[PDB]
Amino acid sequence: KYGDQRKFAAVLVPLTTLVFPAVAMGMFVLYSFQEDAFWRIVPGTKRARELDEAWREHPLFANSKDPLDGLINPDDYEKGLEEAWERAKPAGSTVTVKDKLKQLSKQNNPHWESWRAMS
């Protein structure tokens, strides 16, 4: 008969539109209370820290987060910058290149990514 496929429907439709959705919702609310929940979008999860440290352990990605990464010979760059600043230093100015860069790198933003203290 044209029916006889409803034997499959009477099991599949209740299953996949009631049992599977209910199990999925229960599993989702259970997953919501894991410490790993939404670790890719929610800040301050343990797995995020472990993944970042794992990336940092790779020899290629050691100095990857540094915005100044790339200077093949930073000593040459610093020496050239110091020489160029010496010829342009205003009168009896007492600022050197080294401490100027050191104090231009050190800013005061305590409340930046402070969420790296729980997980």
Residues that bind another protein (CB under 8 A): 1-10, 13, 32-33, 38-43, 45, 47-48, 51-52, 54-55, 57-61, 63-68, 72-73, 101, 104-112, 114-115, 118
Using CA atoms, how far apart are residues 2 and 4, in angstroms rounded to an integer? 7
Residue 67 vs 90, nearer CB to another protein: 67
| DSSP code, position 112 | S
Residue 11 as a binder of ligand CLA (CB under 6 A): the answer is no
Which of another protein, ligand CLA, none interacts with 39 (beta carbon under 5 to 8 A by kind)? another protein
17 binds ligand CLA (CB under 6 A): yes
98 neighbors 78 (Cβ within 8 angstroms): yes
Decide if 115 contacts 46 (C-beta within 8 A). no
Q: Is 13 in the site for ligand CLA (CB under 6 A)?
A: yes
Distance CA(96)–CA(72), nearest Å, equals: 23
∠ CA 53-114-55, rounded to 5°:
10
Point out which residues bind ligand CLA (CB under 6 A): 13, 17
